[PDB]
Amino acid sequence: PSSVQIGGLFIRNTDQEYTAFRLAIFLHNTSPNAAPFNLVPHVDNIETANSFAVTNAFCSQYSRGVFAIFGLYDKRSVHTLTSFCSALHISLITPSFPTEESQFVLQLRPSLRGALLSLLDHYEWNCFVFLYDTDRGYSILQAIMEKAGQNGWHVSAICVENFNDVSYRQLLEELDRRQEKKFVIDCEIERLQNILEQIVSVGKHVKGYHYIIANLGFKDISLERFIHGNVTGFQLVDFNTPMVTKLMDRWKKLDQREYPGSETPPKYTSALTYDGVLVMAETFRSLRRQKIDISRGDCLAPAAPWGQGIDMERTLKQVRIQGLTGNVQFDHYGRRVNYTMDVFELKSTGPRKVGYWNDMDKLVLIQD
Amino acid sequence: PSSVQIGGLFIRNTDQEYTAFRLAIFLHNTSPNASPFNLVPHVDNIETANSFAVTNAFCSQYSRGVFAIFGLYDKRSVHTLTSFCSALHISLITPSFPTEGESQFVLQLRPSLRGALLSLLDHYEWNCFVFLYDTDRGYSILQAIMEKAGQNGWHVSAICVENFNDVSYRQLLEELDRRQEKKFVIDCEIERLQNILEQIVSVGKHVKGYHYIIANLGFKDISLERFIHGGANVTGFQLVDFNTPMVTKLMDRWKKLDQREYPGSETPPKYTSALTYDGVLVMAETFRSLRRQKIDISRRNAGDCLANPAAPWGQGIDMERTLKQVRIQGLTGNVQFDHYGRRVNYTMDVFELKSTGPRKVGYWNDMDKLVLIQ
Amino acid sequence: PSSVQIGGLFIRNTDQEYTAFRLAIFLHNTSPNASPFNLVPHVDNIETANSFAVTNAFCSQYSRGVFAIFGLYDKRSVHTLTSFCSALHISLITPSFPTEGESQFVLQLRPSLRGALLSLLDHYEWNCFVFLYDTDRGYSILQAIMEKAGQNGWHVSAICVENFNDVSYRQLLEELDRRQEKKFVIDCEIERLQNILEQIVSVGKHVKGYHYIIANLGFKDISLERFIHGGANVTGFQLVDFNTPMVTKLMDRWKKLDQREYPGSETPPKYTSALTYDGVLVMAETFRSLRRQKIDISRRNAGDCLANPAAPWGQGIDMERTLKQVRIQGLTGNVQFDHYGRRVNYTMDVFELKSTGPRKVGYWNDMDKLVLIQ
Amino acid sequence: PSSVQIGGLFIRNTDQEYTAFRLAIFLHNTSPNAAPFNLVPHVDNIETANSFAVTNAFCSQYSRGVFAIFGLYDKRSVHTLTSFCSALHISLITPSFPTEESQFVLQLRPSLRGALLSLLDHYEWNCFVFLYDTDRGYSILQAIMEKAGQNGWHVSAICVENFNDVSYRQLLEELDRRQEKKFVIDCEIERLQNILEQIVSVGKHVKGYHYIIANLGFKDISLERFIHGNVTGFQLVDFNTPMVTKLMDRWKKLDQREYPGSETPPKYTSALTYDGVLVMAETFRSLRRQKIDISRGDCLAPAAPWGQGIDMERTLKQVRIQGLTGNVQFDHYGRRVNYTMDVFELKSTGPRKVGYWNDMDKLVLIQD
């Protein structure tokens, strides 16, 4: 097997992720090293991102026999993509939000719930607001509410879906009336820019107000205005490693005509997509090493089980490499294990690393 | 067109709903000729209730040439079913929880409950209470409760009761009793609701001084004899009125039914049974309206539910418009939808438990909010 | 004499006892030849359980040439049955309540409970408590409790629960709660005991701070899951030991029984079932003893139970003496009677209810009174 | 019908009752007035008074077809006599203790429970002792205990069955140690004499100690020692009526050879037996007036019902005469209704009537 077909499912507002996925495949195509299989993606980008489009693209990919699909989903499509992959015995590698038991799924994105809870405990926060959206699911929100109930917190959860400039202004005025000082922001990247620009315009960009940015791309979003005017966040990928250095000095190639979004440093989702490509490449090497000839139907047949799918799924779930997100390893549930992320607090000189959070030592802070 | 094909979807633990569907369609079929058509149902009762099984069944229904589909869904299968129905212009009638956040080609028989519950909480002047909930029916109630609490500064302790056993409920109740919190709001599945009520009786939290609010439309569908004797304050919402000619006739027919042929007939129909009965009535009236509007219906189509590109039904827009343009009287009252698909101009009774039993204290309507009897 | 005729009397709601009687006699009949006789029972199961029906059945048994009679009686039929048995020298074996106040030709399988209950009350240092009782099993316990209270100056409030419905129990519990009395002693029929326990759970009196004492020998024969979860202190007396080879073998045979042929086998045997099983064992051993003593038995007689003048059986005195001179091991322990007919040298376990469940706290015996585990 | 056979069942220590029953029959034999039926009793006195003797005598009487039996029973024989009479459809007239629903039974003795409770309420007794026996049943005892529980009384119930002189002495010493001042005595007549003589010997016969004698024969027991040394009691029959005057001036005939016990004024049980004879005579007149020819088996047949027994039983239950115990009338349950009894309190001059108790006005006391 030298031309291995794989499937790719992307949704709207994922230009950078698609570019990173293409770049990872291209590097895998030009990496001789030690079977020389070349990954050809049958990528099917969908704009609507509704359940019907997900089903249509998934069945079309299944008709081509891709043995695996690298997909991205939202709250409205997770229950469709995961269900089809679990029933049709095709492994599903997704860098999107993890799903709170599951099969045939590899969630590359680490669960942000644990890190956020540890940070809140360390900062001894008792009353705060929870400006949030539902795009990534009700995983952080439920944990915050449950933790507040078990700890007697005065939390004010505020949904900011379908908000316009008037809505943000009204919300800001209400917060000023309540004199809320501590904020937790959990929204999509574009919504983060909208919230941050509205806050800096209305006049709450000072260091007295504490803002926790609940995402893994803290350095991926520009916060230059806040230095002039206490902001904490989580960073997933370390920029001081040899492998990310190789990615950067290969990323400087500004072929924006063929690689849109390459003008800026890759976002955390882009790093996760690159890491997923490495996981698929490494596990294909493992299957080839085990001398398992992977080969082969249509959707809505009754289930069309894949005999080789179970062993292939297990091989994915037992991979352990050193990727952009560190020790990439999965447990038997498909989640991420043995991972760490740095905690950056903004200072006068810029972002500064205070500590890092991992699943075995919780949060550990640098002290003298 | 004497025969009309109607799709039907049923999930697990919905036996009573299926019998109500069969009973409603039988009454319409065996009815005096109010001058004219028959409904043939293609029904699929899947137990797993996963998205893949729902998609397979919906494709089978689409291949079977159904004009409308009566489906049940949970948080798992809500998105796939609604999106598939809207994409192919095949309308759906559901008694499940609403999917607020815009929609098309879907008619929610179940009315919104957030307004009534919020009105009740404002009337009771509650500040701190334990909100026990699950995520089987979405998160609309949970989001609304917390948004109201944040705007009003309520210290609401929300606890999810998913995947808890009897020991877990006992430990949770003991911890809450140690925290000295008296007010509770329960919004769970009917099976989980029975389990929590049994655990409350076992612990001994059904005495005077404890207030429980049951957030569903089946307050009279459950047993509270232990709570009646204990004397704890219980408030609930009942949608089905038992003092109307229509419910009386249906109950008379309900008691005279074969238990083996109609499982669940040994007990009074629940609010979901009334809701699904109303849904069949809505479909019948809309087909009459299509006949009156001189709009002929035909499938014209095959079963390529995944035809590329999509081939939406040409008469779906008119069918959806007619479905939303029907005002009828049923077990739940004035069944009348707006242009969105939700229920509007609906009324529900509010029952407070006393020693004599469940006595209505007032009603709630979309216009006057909560009006209590004084 | 291969065949031995034995009389049997059963009152209403004693199905389990009858099956235990049949099971015990079947095991003796189908047993290895421990070197020799069979027991044929003449059984009468009257439902009214009045004195006239008992007299008719006893005359039929006497006309049927039975040497011993296994009878059940209540306060209504205790005097007629005991007097008839003593007058004609036809001995009786009973598991019912004792008839203290002298007796002859009667063997009480059920041991006296007043000693154990009085010892428990003295240990608990109780002063004021509510004694709920009925009069189905005589008045010996009631008289003893009040005599002890008078000699010790206890303010015992005794209430009879005869001919009360569920509303009556609820009203009585509410009145007692208003009077602020926490300690209760329940001595009722097993059916009435279940009803009172259910009412206690419904009212909500099964929480910490309430102490209940159940005065019977079937503490493990009833369900207290609600009381286990509530945490109220419950003390009871268990006569049957479940950690002996004999009870283990009998339980193994009990589970492998036909439910239709042996009603009540779906549940573990109650203390009365163990008592009646022991009674059949006592009769078997005594017949062996008569065979060993070279005392031939024969009815010699007709059925003129009302023969004037009375014609008592000539071998009745020796039979009664041999019955009282037998020490055996059975489900209730060392079954051994004195010259009066009551049980002596008997032990019963004392169980206190905790979160883990019913855990034995000590035992009670006729010699050392109450000995608790420390 | 001129020679009507009836049955008579008497127990040990009932010589006076048997004499009164014989005297009443004799007067009925010599009372022409206005069918001239003469009552012939097949009396079967039993000494053992156990259940076997009761059954034997009852069956022998049934063999003679007596249509009714005038019986006396104790705690050990009530459940046998009543059961046979209810099942065999023969009316049972008994002057013994009433039974707390029943059929074919006429209890001539009024229920003493109501009068005792009313007297205790009037005297405002809170703590007392209850020297009692079980011969007449647990009817008064249960009521006293239940009333005490509902009123919070400090009652000390003391059984005095099988007590010898040492037992009474020990009981008296214990009472002195407890310093109990108020006594309620409910025992058989012979036990009353034993208790009273022991009390007067030990030295508690003074007026300071209050003794309530729970019986209907207060004047039938000599209390002369207490006048020299507060004793209340109930009297059922009034000695100041024309009919009791006739009974007295006929009772002075001292034919003790044929009428034992006639040397003393009749006891309350004797008056009840005399009244029962009148009830049977009056109801036979009613049956004869209704032109119902009463006629007719063996016991232990299966039930041998008597068709005329039901109407005869109802006629007994609807009789209303003026006898020694006043307005003799029975309800549909066989108990006594529309009856009254005087309450006598001992004074220096002797017994004095304070008031009277009836079932409609409870207790009413004479005051100026």
Question: Closest-CA residue in chain A for B309?
Answer: A56
Whether the CB-CB separation of A234 and A185 falls below 8 Å is answered with: no
Nearest to A149 among B50, B143, B157 (CB): B157
Residue C207 DSSP class: B
Which residues sit opposite B187 in a β-bridge? Answer: B133
Residue C313 DSSP class: -
Cα–Cα dist A293/B374, whole Å: 79
Cα–Cα dist C295/C40, whole Å: 20
Cα–Cα dist D43/D241, whole Å: 30
Structure tokens given for C334: 């060392």
Q: Which residues of B touch C210 (CB under 8 A)?
A: none
Which residues sit opposite C353 in a β-bridge? Answer: C358
Cα–Cα dist B36/D60, whole Å: 86
Residue C220, phi then psi, degrees to nearest 5: -80, -5
- Would you call D86 and C155 a contact, using CB atoms and an 8 Å cutoff? no
| Distance of alpha carbon B312 from the chain centroid | 28
Q: Which residues of C touch B167 (CB under 8 A)?
A: none
Q: Chain A within 8 Å of B304 (Cβ-Cβ)?
A: no
Sign of CA dihedral C171, C172, C178, C182: negative
- Would you call A76 and B79 a contact, using CB atoms and an 8 Å cutoff? yes
Of B311, B317, B306, the closest CA to residue B58 belongs to B306
Whether the CB-CB separation of C180 and C209 falls below 8 Å is answered with: no
- Would you call B52 and A138 a contact, using CB atoms and an 8 Å cutoff? no
E strand spans, chain C: 3-10, 38-45, 68-70, 91-94, 106-108, 130-133, 157-160, 183-187, 211-214, 233-238, 327-330, 333-336, 347-353, 358-365, 369-372
Question: Which superfamily does B3-111+243-343 belong to?
Answer: Response regulator (3.40.50.2300)
**What is each CA distance from B145 to A162, B117, B123, B149, B187, in whole angstroms?**
18, 9, 15, 6, 11
Helix runs in B105-243, H state only = 114-124, 140-152, 166-178, 190-203, 225-230
| Distance of alpha carbon A191 from the chain centroid | 16
Cα–Cα dist C197/D322, whole Å: 51
Structure tokens given for C220: 């493990």
- Would you call D142 and C160 a contact, using CB atoms and an 8 Å cutoff? yes
Number of neighbours of residue C241 by Cβ within 10 angstroms: 17
Cα–Cα dist C115/A73, whole Å: 76
Helix runs in chain B, H state only = 15-29, 51-63, 78-87, 114-124, 140-152, 166-178, 190-203, 225-230, 245-255, 271-292, 316-324
Residue D69, phi then psi, degrees to nearest 5: -130, 130
β-bridge pairing D68-71 and A105-107: unpaired
Which residues sit opposite D93 in a β-bridge? Answer: D70, D106
Residue D281 DSSP class: H
* Sequence-separated (6 or more) residues with CB below 8 Å from residue A153: A125, A126, A127, A128, A147
Region for C153 from its dihedrals, namely left if φ exceeds 0, alpha if ψ lies in -120 to 50, beta otherwise: left
Cα–Cα dist C274/C247, whole Å: 9
Whether the CB-CB separation of C226 and C206 falls below 8 Å is answered with: yes
E strand spans, chain D: 3-10, 38-45, 68-71, 91-94, 105-107, 127-132, 154-159, 182-186, 210-213, 231-235, 320-323, 326-330, 336-337, 340-347, 350-358, 362-365
Question: Closest-CA residue in chain C for D49?
Answer: C83
**What is each CA distance from B322 to B35, B55, B332, in whole angstroms?**
20, 26, 20
Q: How far is B88 from chain C (nearest CA, A)?
A: 54
- Would you call D51 and C157 a contact, using CB atoms and an 8 Å cutoff? no
Number of neighbours of residue D210 by Cβ within 10 angstroms: 16
| Distance of alpha carbon D126 from the chain centroid | 28
Tokens 């089903």 correspond to what residue? Answer: A55
**What is each CA distance from B61 to A274, A295, C241, in whole angstroms?**
41, 33, 64
Cα–Cα dist A23/A249, whole Å: 13
Question: Closest-CA residue in chain B for C226?
Answer: B202
Nearest to B229 among C203, C225, C226 (CB): C203
What 3-state class would DSSP assign to C43? strand
- Would you call C147 and D159 a contact, using CB atoms and an 8 Å cutoff? yes
User: Which residues numbered 60-89 in C keep a CB inside 8 Å of some CB on D?
Assistant: 75-77, 79-80, 82-84, 87
Is it true that the peptide bond before C245 is cis, omega within 30 degrees of 0? no
Number of neighbours of residue C125 by Cβ within 10 angstroms: 6
**Kind and range of the H or E element at A146?**
helix A140-151
Q: Which method was used?
A: cryo-EM
What 3-state class would DSSP assign to B360? strand
Which of A247-254's residues contact partners 24+ apart within 8 Å by CB, and which partners? A247/A274, A247/A324, A250/A23, A250/A27, A251/A23
For CATH 3.40.50.2300, the residue range(s) in chain A are 3-110+240-337, 112-235+341-365
Cα–Cα dist D215/D192, whole Å: 10
Structure tokens given for C110: 């059920």
- Would you call C226 and B170 a contact, using CB atoms and an 8 Å cutoff? no
Whether the CB-CB separation of B12 and A47 falls below 8 Å is answered with: no
- Exposure string over B193-228, b if 16+ CB within 10 A, otherwise e: bebbbebbbbbbbbeeebebbbbbbbbbbeebebbb
Cα–Cα dist B153/A177, whole Å: 12
Whether the CB-CB separation of C186 and C214 falls below 8 Å is answered with: yes
Structure tokens given for B35: 């001058």
Which residues sit opposite C10 in a β-bridge? Answer: C45
Residue B50, phi then psi, degrees to nearest 5: -85, 170
Radius of gyration of chain B (CA): 22
Q: Cα-Cα-Cα-Cα dihedral of C84, C85, C89, C95, to 10°? A: -170
Structure tokens given for C151: 């000699």
Cα–Cα dist B155/D230, whole Å: 71
**What is each CA distance from B246 to B249, B262, B278, in whole angstroms?**
5, 20, 11
β-bridge pairing C358-365 and C347-353: antiparallel
What 3-state class would DSSP assign to C290? helix
Q: How far is C226 from chain B (nearest CA, A)?
A: 5
Which residues sit opposite B108 in a β-bridge? Answer: B94
Whether the CB-CB separation of D220 and D269 falls below 8 Å is answered with: no
Residue A9 DSSP class: E
Number of neighbours of residue C85 by Cβ within 10 angstroms: 27
Question: Which superfamily does C114-238+348-372 belong to?
Answer: Response regulator (3.40.50.2300)
**Type of residue numbered C279:** G
E strand spans, A47-122: 68-71, 91-94, 105-107
- Exposure string over A285-304, b if 16+ CB within 10 A, otherwise e: eebeeeeeebeeeebbeeee
Cα–Cα dist C99/D2, whole Å: 47
* Sequence-separated (6 or more) residues with CB below 8 Å from residue C289: C322, C325, C326
Residue C74 DSSP class: -
CATH architecture of A3-110+240-337: 3-Layer(aba) Sandwich (3.40)
**Kind and range of the H or E element at B40?**
strand B38-45
Region for A300 from its dihedrals, namely left if φ exceeds 0, alpha if ψ lies in -120 to 50, beta otherwise: left
Sign of CA dihedral C181, C182, C186, C192: positive
* Sequence-separated (6 or more) residues with CB below 8 Å from residue A209: A181, A182, A183, A230
Number of neighbours of residue C47 by Cβ within 10 angstroms: 11
Residue A184 DSSP class: E
Number of neighbours of residue D107 by Cβ within 10 angstroms: 22
β-bridge pairing B327-330 and B233-238: unpaired
Whether the CB-CB separation of C74 and C49 falls below 8 Å is answered with: yes
**What is each CA distance from D337 to B80, D278, D327, in whole angstroms?**
82, 17, 8
Q: Which residues of C touch D50 (CB under 8 A)?
A: 83, 87
Burial class (CB in 10 A: 0-12, 13-18, 19+), A280: buried
Structure tokens given for D245: 């005057």
Could you tell me the strand order of the sheet in which C183-187 lies? C157-160, C130-133, C183-187, C211-214, C233-238, C347-353, C358-365, C369-372
Structure tokens given for A185: 């922001």
Structure tokens given for A142: 């439920």
Q: Cα-Cα-Cα-Cα dihedral of D127, D130, D136, D142, to 10°? A: 40
The fold adopted by the segment(s) A112-235+341-365 is Rossmann fold (3.40.50)
**Kind and range of the H or E element at C58?**
helix C51-63
Number of neighbours of residue B159 by Cβ within 10 angstroms: 17
Cα–Cα dist D110/D339, whole Å: 8
β-bridge pairing C211-214 and C183-187: parallel
Q: Chain C within 8 Å of D201 (Cβ-Cβ)?
A: no
Chain breaks in chain A (C to N over 2.5 A) after: 34, 100, 229, 296, 301
Of A61, A37, A65, A81, the closest CA to residue A277 belongs to A37
